Design an enzyme around this catalytic site. Structure first.
Site, PDB file in Angstrom:
ATOM      1  N   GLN A 131       0.845  -1.188   0.000  1.00 56.77           N
ATOM      2  CA  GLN A 131       0.000   0.000   0.000  1.00 56.77           C
ATOM      3  C   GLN A 131       0.896   1.260   0.000  1.00 56.77           C
ATOM      4  OE1 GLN A 131      -2.332   2.446  -0.540  1.00 56.77           O
ATOM      5  NE2 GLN A 131      -1.521   3.011   1.480  1.00 56.77           N
ATOM      6  N   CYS A 132       1.185   1.789  -1.188  1.00 54.32           N
ATOM      7  CA  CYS A 132       2.186   2.848  -1.295  1.00 54.32           C
ATOM      8  C   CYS A 132       1.673   4.267  -1.063  1.00 54.32           C
ATOM      9  CB  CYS A 132       2.926   2.764  -2.624  1.00 54.32           C
ATOM     10  SG  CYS A 132       3.978   1.331  -2.730  1.00 54.32           S
ATOM     11  N   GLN A 133       0.378   4.498  -1.270  1.00 54.59           N
ATOM     12  CA  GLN A 133      -0.143   5.849  -1.135  1.00 54.59           C
ATOM     13  C   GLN A 133      -0.195   6.206   0.355  1.00 54.59           C
ATOM     14  OE1 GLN A 133      -4.172   6.989  -2.388  1.00 54.59           O
ATOM     15  NE2 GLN A 133      -3.371   8.704  -3.585  1.00 54.59           N
ATOM     16  N   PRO A 263      -6.259  -1.640   4.657  1.00 53.69           N
ATOM     17  CA  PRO A 263      -6.679  -0.467   5.446  1.00 53.69           C
ATOM     18  C   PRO A 263      -7.717   0.469   4.815  1.00 53.69           C
ATOM     19  CG  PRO A 263      -4.401  -0.224   4.656  1.00 53.69           C
ATOM     20  CD  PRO A 263      -4.798  -1.650   4.414  1.00 53.69           C
ATOM     21  N   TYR A 264      -8.000   0.317   3.521  1.00 51.37           N
ATOM     22  CA  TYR A 264      -8.931   1.227   2.842  1.00 51.37           C
ATOM     23  C   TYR A 264     -10.079   0.503   2.134  1.00 51.37           C
ATOM     24  CZ  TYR A 264      -5.063   4.419   3.807  1.00 51.37           C
ATOM     25  OH  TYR A 264      -4.089   5.159   4.440  1.00 51.37           O
ATOM     26  N   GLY A 266     -10.750   0.938  -0.979  1.00 55.51           N
ATOM     27  CA  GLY A 266     -10.115   0.553  -2.226  1.00 55.51           C
ATOM     28  C   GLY A 266      -8.870   1.371  -2.501  1.00 55.51           C
ATOM     29  N   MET A 267      -8.034   0.876  -3.405  1.00 56.74           N
ATOM     30  CA  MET A 267      -6.850   1.593  -3.868  1.00 56.74           C
ATOM     31  C   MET A 267      -6.766   1.424  -5.386  1.00 56.74           C
ATOM     32  SD  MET A 267      -4.442   3.529  -3.311  1.00 56.74           S
ATOM     33  CE  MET A 267      -3.424   4.155  -4.649  1.00 56.74           C
ATOM     34  N   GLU A 268      -6.764   2.552  -6.103  1.00 59.01           N
ATOM     35  CA  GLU A 268      -6.890   2.594  -7.569  1.00 59.01           C
ATOM     36  C   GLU A 268      -5.616   2.167  -8.340  1.00 59.01           C
ATOM     37  OE1 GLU A 268      -6.869   5.189  -5.359  1.00 59.01           O
ATOM     38  OE2 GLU A 268      -5.857   6.934  -6.174  1.00 59.01           O
ATOM     39  N   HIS A 292     -15.957   4.450  -7.688  1.00 58.12           N
ATOM     40  CA  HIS A 292     -14.912   5.375  -7.254  1.00 58.12           C
ATOM     41  C   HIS A 292     -13.526   4.937  -7.749  1.00 58.12           C
ATOM     42  CE1 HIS A 292     -13.148   8.308  -4.356  1.00 58.12           C
ATOM     43  NE2 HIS A 292     -12.161   7.433  -4.326  1.00 58.12           N
ATOM     44  N   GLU A 293     -13.176   3.676  -7.506  1.00 62.31           N
ATOM     45  CA  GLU A 293     -11.874   3.200  -7.981  1.00 62.31           C
ATOM     46  C   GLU A 293     -11.776   3.260  -9.513  1.00 62.31           C
ATOM     47  OE1 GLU A 293      -9.673   3.098  -5.757  1.00 62.31           O
ATOM     48  OE2 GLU A 293     -11.176   3.182  -4.166  1.00 62.31           O
ATOM     49  N   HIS A 296     -10.942   6.739 -10.730  1.00 64.65           N
ATOM     50  CA  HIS A 296      -9.551   7.118 -10.531  1.00 64.65           C
ATOM     51  C   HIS A 296      -8.703   6.828 -11.775  1.00 64.65           C
ATOM     52  CE1 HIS A 296      -8.834   8.853  -6.660  1.00 64.65           C
ATOM     53  NE2 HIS A 296      -9.323   7.837  -5.971  1.00 64.65           N
ATOM     54  N   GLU A 315      -9.189  13.396  -5.232  1.00 67.77           N
ATOM     55  CA  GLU A 315     -10.367  12.827  -4.554  1.00 67.77           C
ATOM     56  C   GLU A 315     -11.688  13.497  -4.872  1.00 67.77           C
ATOM     57  OE1 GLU A 315     -10.210  10.003  -3.627  1.00 67.77           O
ATOM     58  OE2 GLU A 315      -8.026   9.755  -3.529  1.00 67.77           O
ATOM     59  N   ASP A 372      -0.564  10.403   6.518  1.00 68.09           N
ATOM     60  CA  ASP A 372      -1.438   9.390   7.126  1.00 68.09           C
ATOM     61  C   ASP A 372      -2.217   9.917   8.329  1.00 68.09           C
ATOM     62  OD1 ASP A 372      -0.778   7.461   5.279  1.00 68.09           O
ATOM     63  OD2 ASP A 372       0.757   6.468   6.514  1.00 68.09           O
ATOM     64  N   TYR A 380     -12.081  14.600   0.008  1.00 68.73           N
ATOM     65  CA  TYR A 380     -13.177  13.909  -0.681  1.00 68.73           C
ATOM     66  C   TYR A 380     -14.446  14.766  -0.753  1.00 68.73           C
ATOM     67  CZ  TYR A 380     -10.441   9.530   0.009  1.00 68.73           C
ATOM     68  OH  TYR A 380      -9.456   8.566   0.008  1.00 68.73           O
ATOM     69  N   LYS A 562     -11.484   3.193   8.188  1.00 69.86           N
ATOM     70  CA  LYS A 562     -12.800   3.834   8.269  1.00 69.86           C
ATOM     71  C   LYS A 562     -13.648   3.257   9.412  1.00 69.86           C
ATOM     72  CE  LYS A 562     -16.901   4.982   5.487  1.00 69.86           C
ATOM     73  NZ  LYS A 562     -17.645   4.708   4.219  1.00 69.86           N
TER      74      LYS A 562
HETATM   75  N1  LIG Z   1      -3.925   7.264   1.636  1.00 68.02           N
HETATM   76  C1  LIG Z   1      -2.694   7.957   1.963  1.00 68.02           C
HETATM   77  C2  LIG Z   1      -2.948   9.446   2.005  1.00 68.02           C
HETATM   78  C3  LIG Z   1      -3.164  10.147   0.824  1.00 68.02           C
HETATM   79  C4  LIG Z   1      -3.398  11.517   0.862  1.00 68.02           C
HETATM   80  C5  LIG Z   1      -3.419  12.185   2.082  1.00 68.02           C
HETATM   81  C6  LIG Z   1      -3.670  13.653   2.123  1.00 68.02           C
HETATM   82  C7  LIG Z   1      -3.352  14.721   1.292  1.00 68.02           C
HETATM   83  C8  LIG Z   1      -3.816  15.960   1.760  1.00 68.02           C
HETATM   84  C9  LIG Z   1      -4.517  15.959   2.967  1.00 68.02           C
HETATM   85  S1  LIG Z   1      -4.578  14.262   3.525  1.00 68.02           S
HETATM   86  C10 LIG Z   1      -3.203  11.482   3.262  1.00 68.02           C
HETATM   87  C11 LIG Z   1      -2.969  10.113   3.224  1.00 68.02           C
HETATM   88 ZN   LIG Z   2     -10.089   7.953  -3.949  1.00 65.26          ZN
END
Ligand SMILES: NCc1ccc(-c2cccs2)cc1
Ligand SMILES: [Zn+2]
Ligand SMILES: [Yb+3]
Length: 606
Positions: A131-133, A263-264, A266-268, A292-293, A296, A315, A372, A380, A562
């Site tokens: 999970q890189c994002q 943890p989410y 979904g991840m796109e 949603h995915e 993206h 988002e 994080d 969103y 969530k």
């Molecule tokens: N899913 C990882 C993640 C991606 C984006 C963000 C934010 C960017 C700007 C405000 S929160 C925080 C965590």
């Molecule tokens: Zn999204």
């Protein structure tokens, strides 16, 4: 510039391609191999460059067949450690070289969760997922860990032969490993330039079933049939998304249904969206997450936020498209219902953070902030609210969808800021600048709290939810008898969920009311994860001790943040469950997702 990255910026040098050659060692919980970065200089006389890393062991760095000097700086908390590489020959502008880095990850890599066989469905094999994002790619391999840089990639991944590797890429074949006959090498190609946060890998006992002309669903065998049914709207949503966004450029759209600790929602990840198994409601009711995915694939993956300060771009536009897909499928009244629900979720977040909190700004400043920790519904829902408001300002959904398509077209394969977006909005709607100049840009983009203006929402599907919620809230003991299962007769699962969301906003309710709700509505029997989540929050906040083991069970048996975070927080805030909440976290912490473990820990102050 990107205040979350320690690497040389795109103005200095740009990674064009990654060739990843690695082996997944489940006994050591390490990924080991080489990352060959094709790097283009943007500068004259370039003699060194810096990459992001996090908990990586570097063995060596090879350029032109020779090892070169490099240095790892001091760790800078969640950002990791900068890696400076000394180039053997000064580069001129636009010159490209290949830098091959031998590396090994830490078992504690914040990008990865390593699961034992017992944490899987099959109970025989272990499982790895990434999970890189936002900024965890550096915890897998040295890179310019910034979405301002886009690169293609190819990969060869050696795994135990009884397991399957999948990546955010087109599958490019498999063979026995020549260096180890107990192993298989899986190969992958991603021909479309992507930001590194979209690099993804899973290794496990995966099976697949086709569910559309360009979609396989992947999961452990135990989940295949259920997933196939749950996500059968996927092709229809793809076709609508293509109509709104333009051509789907990624080839395949596969789905991976992860184990419960993902943890989410979904991840796109391109070519292979990852989803939580908490979507498996049995009735396709949580398919907005697929929509949603899917979205993206345009907003985020084609048009990408330049830095994480501008995450709302990703988002907001994605939720905007998401709700259009669902409106096309189920009606404009349903799009409005979902939009208004979204505003409610925004009210909740703002209330939670506090109306003056910096994280309630649409555009944020992430300097010295772990993304994080900052993550919320705000980008969103405040992002969506801005777009929905603009839609209504500028002549409606048909007109604003013209802008969204032109926007995708204009910025495809690029990374952009809020100003880039705003500049194009003004260009596209140049005959409506007078109307655009009425928007309070400073407030919408840069001020904390609820937006300065609330959009107009059709109320049709919402009315019955509010009406019933109000009945319960205003009820006295002598009114409780008048409640009955028939109250729910004409309510969809979506409406049941919104009824609960409305009521939860006024929680706690009297304990006797909640007991009665269970008596007449039997909410304990509902396995829809969104519904069960809000119902358990309502029970705990209303101090029903009976709900304690139910809330503890949901919080731990899945790990979608969530659900897990607020359930844990609720349990901690209830004096009767506080100690058990803390003890349960302590006992599960080592086997949790590392990001989830960190955040629940912070939430609980343990
Ligand atoms: N899913 C990882 C993640 C991606 C984006 C963000 C934010 C960017 C700007 C405000 S929160 C925080 C965590
Ligand atoms: Zn999204
Ligand atoms: Yb009364």
């Amino acid at each position: 510039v990107d205040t979350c990255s320690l690497a040389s910026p795109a103005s200095v040098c740009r990674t064009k391609h990654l060739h990843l050659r690695c082996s997944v060692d489940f006994t050591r919980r390490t990924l080991t191999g080489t990352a060959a970065l094709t790097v283009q200089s943007q500068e004259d006389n370039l003699r060194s460059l810096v990459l992001d890393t996090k908990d990586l062991t570097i063995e060596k760095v090879v350029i032109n067949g020779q090892e070169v000097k490099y240095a790892l700086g001091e760790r800078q908390s969640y950002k990791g450690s900068p890696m400076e590489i000394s180039l053997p020959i000064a580069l001129s502008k636009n010159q490209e070289i290949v830098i091959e880095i031998s590396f090994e990850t830490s078992p504690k890599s914040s990008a990865l969760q390593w699961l034992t066989p017992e944490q899987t469905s099959g109970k025989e094999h272990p499982y790895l997922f990434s999970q890189c994002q936002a900024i965890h790619c550096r915890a897998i391999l040295p890179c310019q860990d910034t979405p301002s840089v886009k690169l293609t990639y190819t990969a060869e991944v050696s795994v135990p032969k009884e397991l399957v590797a999948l990546m955010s890429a087109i599958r490019d074949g498999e063979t026995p490993d020549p260096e180890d006959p107990s192993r298989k090498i899986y190969k992958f190609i991603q021909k479309v330039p992507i930001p590194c946060y979209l690099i993804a890998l899973v290794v496990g006992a995966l099976e697949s079933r086709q569910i559309g002309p360009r979609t396989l669903v992947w999961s452990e065998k135990e989940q295949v049939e259920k997933s196939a049914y749950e996500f059968s709207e996927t092709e229809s949503m793809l076709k609508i998304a293509e109509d709104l966004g333009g051509p789907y450029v990624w080839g395949q759209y596969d789905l991976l249904v992860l184990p419960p600790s993902f943890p989410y929602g979904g991840m796109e990840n391109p070519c292979l969206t990852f989803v939580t198994p908490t979507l498996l409601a049995g009735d396709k009711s949580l398919s907005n997450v697929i929509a949603h995915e899917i979205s993206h694939s345009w907003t985020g993956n084609l048009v990408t936020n330049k830095t994480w300060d501008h995450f709302w771009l990703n988002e907001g536009h994605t939720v905007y498209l998401e709700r259009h897909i669902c409106g096309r499928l189920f009606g404009e009244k349903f799009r409005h219902f979902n939009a208004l629900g979204g505003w409610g979720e925004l009210q909740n977040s703002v209330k939670t953070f506090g109306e003056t909190h910096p994280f309630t700004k649409l555009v944020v400043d992430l300097t010295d902030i772990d993304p994080d920790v900052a993550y919320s519904s705000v980008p969103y829902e405040k992002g969506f609210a801005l777009l929905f408001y603009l839609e209504q300002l500028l002549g409606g959904p048909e007109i604003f969808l013209g802008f969204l398509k032109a926007y995708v077209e204009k910025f495809s394969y690029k990374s952009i800021t809020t100003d880039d977006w705003k500049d194009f909005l003004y260009s596209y709607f140049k005959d409506k600048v007078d109307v655009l100049n009425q928007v309070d840009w400073n407030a919408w983009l840069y001020s904390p709290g609820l937006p300065p203006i609330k959009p107009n929402y059709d109320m049709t599907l919402t009315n019955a939810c509010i009406a019933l919620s109000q009945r319960w809230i205003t009820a006295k003991e002598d009114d409780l008898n008048s409640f009955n299962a028939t109250d729910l007769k004409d309510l969809s699962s979506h409406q049941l969920n919104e009824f609960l969301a409305q009521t939860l906003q006024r929680a706690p309710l009297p304990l006797g009311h909640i007991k009665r709700m269970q008596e007449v509505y039997n909410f304990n029997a509902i396995n829809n994860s969104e519904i069960r989540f809000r119902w358990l929050r309502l029970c705990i906040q209303s101090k029903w001790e009976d709900a304690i083991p139910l809330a503890l069970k949901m919080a731990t048996e899945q790990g979608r943040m969530k659900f897990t975070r607020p359930l844990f927080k609720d349990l901690a805030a209830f004096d009767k469950s506080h100690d058990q909440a803390v003890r349960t976290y302590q006992e599960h912490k080592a086997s949790m997702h590392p990001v989830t473990a960190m955040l629940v820990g912070k939430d609980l102050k343990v």
